[PDB]
Amino acid sequence: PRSEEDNELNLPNLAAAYSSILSSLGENPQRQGLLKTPWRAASAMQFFTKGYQETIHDEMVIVKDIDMFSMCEHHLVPFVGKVHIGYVLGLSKLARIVEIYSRRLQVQERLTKQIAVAITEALRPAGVGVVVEATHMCMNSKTVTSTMLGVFREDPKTREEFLTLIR
Amino acid sequence: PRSEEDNELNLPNLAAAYSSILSSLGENPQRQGLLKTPWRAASAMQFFTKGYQETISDVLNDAIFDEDHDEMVIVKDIDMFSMCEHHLVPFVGKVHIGYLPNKQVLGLSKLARIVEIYSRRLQVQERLTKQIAVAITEALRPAGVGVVVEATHMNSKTVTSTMLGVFREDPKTREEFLTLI
Amino acid sequence: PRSEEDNELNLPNLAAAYSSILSSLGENPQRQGLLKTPWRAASAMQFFTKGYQETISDVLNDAIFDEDHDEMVIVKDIDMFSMCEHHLVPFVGKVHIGYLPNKQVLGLSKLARIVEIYSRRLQVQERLTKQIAVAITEALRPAGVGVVVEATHSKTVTSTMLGVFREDPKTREEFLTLIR
Amino acid sequence: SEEDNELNLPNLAAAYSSILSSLGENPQRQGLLKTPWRAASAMQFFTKGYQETIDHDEMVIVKDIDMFSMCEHHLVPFVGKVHIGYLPNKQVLGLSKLARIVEIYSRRLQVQERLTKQIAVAITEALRPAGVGVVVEATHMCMVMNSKTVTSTMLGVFREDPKTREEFLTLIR
Amino acid sequence: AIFDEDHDEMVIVKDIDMFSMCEHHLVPFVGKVHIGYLPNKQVLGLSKLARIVEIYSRRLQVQERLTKQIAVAITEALRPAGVGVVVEATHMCMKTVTSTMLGVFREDPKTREEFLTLIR
Amino acid sequence: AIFDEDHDEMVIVKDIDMFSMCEHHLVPFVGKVHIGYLPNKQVLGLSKLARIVEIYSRRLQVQERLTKQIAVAITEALRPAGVGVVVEATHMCMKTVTSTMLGVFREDPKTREEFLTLIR
Amino acid sequence: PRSEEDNELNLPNLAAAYSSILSSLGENPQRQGLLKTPWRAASAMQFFTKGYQETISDVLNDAIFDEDHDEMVIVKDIDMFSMCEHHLVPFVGKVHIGYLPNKQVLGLSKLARIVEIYSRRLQVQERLTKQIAVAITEALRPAGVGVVVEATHSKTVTSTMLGVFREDPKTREEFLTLIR
Amino acid sequence: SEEDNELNLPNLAAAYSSILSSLGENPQRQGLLKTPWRAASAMQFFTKGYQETIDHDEMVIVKDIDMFSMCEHHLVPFVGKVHIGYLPNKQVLGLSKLARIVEIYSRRLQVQERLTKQIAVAITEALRPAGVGVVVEATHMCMVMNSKTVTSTMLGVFREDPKTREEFLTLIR
Amino acid sequence: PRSEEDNELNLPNLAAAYSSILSSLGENPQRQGLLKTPWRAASAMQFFTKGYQETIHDEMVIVKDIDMFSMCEHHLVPFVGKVHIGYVLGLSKLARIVEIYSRRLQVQERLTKQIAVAITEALRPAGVGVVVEATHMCMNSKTVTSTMLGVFREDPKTREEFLTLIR
Amino acid sequence: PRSEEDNELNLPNLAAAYSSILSSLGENPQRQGLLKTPWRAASAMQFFTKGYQETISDVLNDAIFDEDHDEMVIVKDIDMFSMCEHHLVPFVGKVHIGYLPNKQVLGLSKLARIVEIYSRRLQVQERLTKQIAVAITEALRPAGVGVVVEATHMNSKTVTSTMLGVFREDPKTREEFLTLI
Ligand SMILES: NC1=NC(=O)C2=NC(=O)SC2=N1
Ligand SMILES: NC1=NC(=O)C2=NC(=O)SC2=N1
Ligand SMILES: NC1=NC(=O)C2=NC(=O)SC2=N1
Ligand SMILES: NC1=NC(=O)C2=NC(=O)SC2=N1
Ligand SMILES: [Zn+2]
Ligand SMILES: [Zn+2]
Ligand SMILES: [Zn+2]
Ligand SMILES: [Zn+2]
Ligand SMILES: [Zn+2]
Ligand SMILES: [Zn+2]
Ligand SMILES: [Zn+2]
Ligand SMILES: [Zn+2]
Ligand SMILES: [Zn+2]
Ligand SMILES: [Zn+2]
């Protein structure tokens, strides 16, 4: 994991790289609006990737419309959307699981699988289903991905009920 | 302006800086998903800032037409994609333009190029709004201009608006534009 | 059950605790806007928990009717207001109910009374969902019961499928599609 | 202060335990065991605002800001949206600062009309602009059925110029 | 009311306005009826289908009974392979959805799934 | 029910559910009430405003009378600069929209225009 | 007015003309689907023109009520079905009515009867619009009447603004916005 | 033929004049003077279809085709939409040809079920494809309240393969 | 006006120009799908420009949602939308007025004015108002233009009522 | 492929043909609104056909990633603009893509480039649909591919669909894709 001291050590290094980008784009890094941009861009990129340092009944429970912000690892442009989860844990820590994996350089299919595997390893339930619907700024087209584990993968009725209960 | 010679020259400089950023973030730039990221991120940033390559004078070449029109012309829901100048993160939205011509009108494709020239740069929404309004005013010299930008940068939309001429002075003109958009 | 005698007896006890809370939060309980807050907050809490006053069997009085089973019966978009037992903060939502009768139907207003008895209590959404389903099952004894509760504490959706609604993919699918 | 919060937390928990008994519940059942403390922390969180403090030619609007507050009459939440608009004089409101202003006043025992005025006065004192407009639309859980309460405070050119006022109200739709 | 067509495929008449009285409390309940049938080469005139809905809806009723009566009336009039009737209504003593599936609409899952999707 | 706030700006409570009986035919009429007022430094508690709507709506009524009664009740309780009440309802013997504007809501065109736009 | 005696007398006359039309179109009037068409078409035409049977004054019977004028009264989205007098083909639409009473209101069902009397006739949309407005004006004698008819014969929208609704920009604007 | 149309036009006008008198109207009033001829031309136009005649691996669908027809029971129009789908065998239906097929059958005294089958059979005979599907959704003015009648005809793989049938019905939504 | 014989004479000339375009684009005009394209493109362009040969109560009458297809004169790409008219003439001939001006190489502002002037010259009414809302393929942004003549330009109440009655 | 050298060489040829068309239609090519139309029409036609300049092999460079994923991936509502090959008139719509990967996935921007390469040409909707499906199949070799194109060319939408592999064979797979789009 990347500790807090790693973040403080790499912050001036990230700012130096963003200063370089401002010059390479044709901008004047000395103009008032850009003066603090190398540090602000560095802090933003550290915040969007803070998940690297992080670590942790007879009814279907679903938490839908959870807002999600991730970064596309191919172009370093954000992708934003919603996560729908099905499977006992509450909204808190479920949100924490989403934020640990979404706050990284990702691909939507990987992010989807990591969320379902994290819920499975935390709760050890009969099954888990995760659907992510997001808009990629690296391309208004929506990308929908899904990962089913346990009874959500094996039982078609369970799988079908979860997919209908999102609307 | 930024030429294509400048773009090819600065591409390795941008890629080298993005390689540096991947290492500083704790990532391994050799993993499959990151291998070409320095170049792809550099090309994306060049594309989001391609408005620096253009000039308002060049955009305005063969752009004005004498139509003998003096009534409100509105172009609404123009898609707009821009770069936040504070954090280098994109912001996306729409532009709604309205003007009252003094017999001269602006070609629709040229109005879209005005929005593109200023939006594809490192910007602040209020500045982008004013630049589009000032460009239309300087090109057409009309009775009035109205420009409204609504964009997503917590969850909420930012709306900015520049009202010039009869759009600032006449309540009926301003009300009509805002209701029609 | 909780009688009206209990309510009038516990009202000063609740108001005294709310007066204490206002002081502990840093507020001045003498300011105009707070003067009657101990009593208003106490009455609100009593109202949000009035389901303790009722029993399952008194609402089942004159609630069952003999009909020759009109296959699946659904009552959707039933407004629901409940209290989170973890923090004593409200949660609001909708209840969608469906059942396949065994020649016995439940009166519409009585179905709403079942939702009210359990929702007006300190709850957890999963428990509230199961209690509504079990109450319908015990009252009608039907082929199956499906209860879907969607609430805001982003939404949480819970569901209890008893009997036919658990076993048969077709009946469960038909219910879930009809509640759109 | 935070010293006050740590001191009053057991006092709040004790009062919530008293409420659990007065409602007819058994505070010893598993689901209620930690409820006095959880309810106390939640109430402290909903009232943390008591602890807190502090060349242009275009209208700037930030609409659909999520807002959550407490009805001071019944101690039941009221949830909604805040729409802010201003005409700047050399100073522009930072989005983080605007959010903190909404938070400082919403995290208190409130009346929607007061909350609306306080946000407007805070923006006026921070930016010193030509004018400010604040509209709050919220659902009150006291009324328990889905009625919205809309309040507004218009300062400066937003109160004086009808065109300015009307443009802000149309743009927040 | 009955016409001979070379037709053995599903005929649906959806969104038929319905106005009935709840017998339990003497308060009205208003909604829509969705009818579907698989004819045995003969079809029912549209205006006659509306009259069937009217005869039963204009009475003191229970939604479950009203749904069954319309379905039984169509079955007895046309003698088709199957009938499906869905009633969705708002009760003034408060949507309640009831359905009666007969013949191929009860027996064949594909047939009822198609009817239920076509009425949305 | 009345509270003193330093408030002289428009307060609106829209989409209040309303259930009333039509006196002419003894059939219900259901809808929404939209209330607006300009206070003279004092405001009305939200729950009390709902109780005013309830006292008059739960009777044998005519929509025009119900609208006026709510407006007159708010005026007499708060004594504000102006009051506006709009009722939109569906009559079961069939939307009917009625409105009563008092004080600044009747006199100032800007004030009524603002109220009518804010309730959409 | 057109009596029910007139209807039964003219039914064979209408059926005979529809039989003639079926032959002139190239059809065989003996085929199953056409056998009763002369009578069905005749009854349909009689139904679409049943407004000739009623008079303006018989629906004005027990229609006016003395109320202390609840300012503007609006009844919007009134379904309307009429017959184009140019080609004898139906046109369907909605009627939005508004009036400012002079302490005299019209019963809701009677307002619907005014729309029906004029719409169930061989019409032109502009005439139907004016007739509804003139009927309300003559029945209540109000400060003003506004009638907007939107129909499909792309939509045609016609409007008649009498008195206050013609003169005052504010009352006309308020009416047109409220009918959204 | 067109000779038949010109011959029967005065006969149709004479019958519409008779209708105008039987309804209680005055056929001499200005607005009705030309109605017999206008009604006759309209009825001829609504029935002009009596005069008229005549390597791939993907489903092709043309949805939301406007359709206007006449109820043969009451002589009142029924208006709606036609959704056509086919799985081609070397031949693709031209959009102009598809429109003419819908027109040839809709411009007659019809029953919706018959109109649906005729369009399907015409596409099958023109393209000779693996299958055809036709769905007609229409509002009948006989029912006079806004009920839609939906009819369908499935031929070939559209009747035999459930997956094909289901894909067509989902794609026309 | 461009007579029918002008159209028949210029049809092979238009086909020859479209054949030239196919070759200049990099396509093979001999492939089956392109063989008849020079003639089909010529007939389509003649149809889109057929308006060049063409020529011709106390209530507000409005005809809204009239479909409109025109050609952008700057790029020869279509622009499609709706026309809303206010002002006695029926739907027929009103549609003919729309089609005479829309079937030409146009600019939306000009098309709008020509429709209002044609209605004014045909009916001689107290006033006329024309609003055109269209999507230009030469750029989903909507362009809205309007022209008011007579009482629609002079009386604000008349103007305001017409603009509200479109929804 | 069509190079930029070809584009500059063919621009006067296209403009000359558009000048000819303006004269043949009865217009005066000297009027203000038409003066630059030969060049603007030529540039527009070049832009609508820029897919001829690209190659599927070039688009597929650094496009496949090994993600250890075997579940359905859908990209819906991809805007699509194309040229009708019969009359040279544009047609516009959307593309919905779905595939079941055999552990290998396609980069989102590369999927958009596949749609762009084939859509920016003189086309027939059925061919465009099949080409996108065949390109994905050949690049990823997945368990199945589904491509649905809905476009506006009387008033009505044309929907075409290519279902390959498990999308053709498994009813549940096909049903899931069609409901999710
Ligand atoms: N709602 C629900 N859906 C399932 O699929 C299920 N499977 C089980 O074992 S318990 C249960 N509840
Ligand atoms: N958009 C805008 N609206 C106003 O009302 C205004 N008033 C001013 O002084 S600067 C300005 N801009
Ligand atoms: N899209 C599509 N759907 C089918 O059902 C089909 N069946 C075939 O033989 S080719 C084909 N394509
Ligand atoms: N509806 C309507 N609106 C007007 O503005 C008008 N002016 C007139 O002279 S007659 C008339 N009718
Ligand atoms: Zn990317
Ligand atoms: Zn930002
Ligand atoms: Zn909670
Ligand atoms: Zn309250
Ligand atoms: Zn009842
Ligand atoms: Zn009544
Ligand atoms: Zn007509
Ligand atoms: Zn019929
Ligand atoms: Zn253009
Ligand atoms: Zn085409």
Residue numbers in the entry:
A (entry chain E), I (entry chain E): 58 to 113, 126 to 156, 162 to 213, 222 to 249
B (entry chain A), J (entry chain A): 58 to 210, 221 to 248
C (entry chain D), G (entry chain D): 58 to 210, 223 to 249
D (entry chain B), H (entry chain B): 60 to 113, 125 to 214, 221 to 249
E (entry chain C), F (entry chain C): 120 to 213, 224 to 249
What does the article say, verbatim?
Guanosine triphosphate (GTP) cyclohydrolase I (GCH1) (EC:3.5.4.16) catalyzes the conversion of GTP to dihydroneopterin triphosphate (H2NTP). This reaction is the first and rate-limiting step involved in the de novo synthesis of tetrahydrobiopterin (BH4). The effects of GFRP on GCH1 occur via formation of heteromeric protein complexes between GCH1 and GFRP, which are dependent on the intracellular concentrations of the effector molecules phenylalanine or BH4. GCH1−GFRP complexes consist of one GCH1 decamer flanked by two pentameric GFRP complexes.
From one cocrystallization campaign, surprisingly, we obtained two independent structures of allosterically inhibited GCH1: one fully inhibited form (xtal_GCH1_allosteric) with all allosteric sites occupied by inhibitor, and a partially inhibited form (xtal_GCH1_allosteric), in which only two of five allosteric pockets in each GCH1 pentamer were occupied with cpd-1. Binding of inhibitors into the allosteric site, which is flanked by two distinct protomers, trigger different process changes in the respective subunits. Binding of cpd-1 induces concomitant approximation of the C-terminal helices and β-strands of subunits A and B (D and E, respectively), while distances between helices B and D, C and D, and A and E remain unchanged relative to the active state of the enzyme.
